[PDB]
Amino acid sequence: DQSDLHISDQTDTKGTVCSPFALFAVLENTGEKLKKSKWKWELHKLENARKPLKDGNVIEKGFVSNQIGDSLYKIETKKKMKPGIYAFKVYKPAGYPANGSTFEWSEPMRLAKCDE
């Protein structure tokens, strides 16, 4: 379908959010209309936030599907996350001409328990 999604917003990478709380990323399609193209995503629990990010433990996953604006999609955890460091990893779909990269990471997001 010649779609082309990039991460345009997310849960803020600065600071630490009191847990448990959901995490999200917004993807903007700047290509042709997303039709049946499958952009797989994974929410990883990381060991650390050092760059470039490293694959961790996949906590949740899915495919980009929920349209929230004319060319805007949102991915959001259905669990609320426990304390930790996390990031979304979004893979290119079958047929995509991967020149730069086969995936895109969000910036990392941190949660910690406040009420103890």
Residue numbers in the entry: 75 to 190
From the paper:
In summary, TapA consists of an Ig domain in its core and flexible N and C termini. TapA thus functions as a chaperone in analogy to the chaperone-usher pathway since it already has a complete and especially stable V-set Ig fold and has the ability to complement TasA in the process of filament formation by donating its previously unstructured N-terminal strand. Owing to the stability of the TapA Ig domain, it is not able to open a cleft to receive a donor strand, and thus can only be located at the beginning of a filament, acting as filament inducer.
The relevance of different TapA sections for promoting oligomer formation was investigated by using truncated proteins. Deleting the N terminus resulted in TapA75-190 that yielded only negligible amounts of oligomers in an AUC run with equimolar concentrations. Structural integrity is supported by a disulfide bond linking C92 and C188. TapA44-253, TapA54-190, and TapA75-190, on the other hand, appeared as monomers, since they contain even numbers of cysteines.
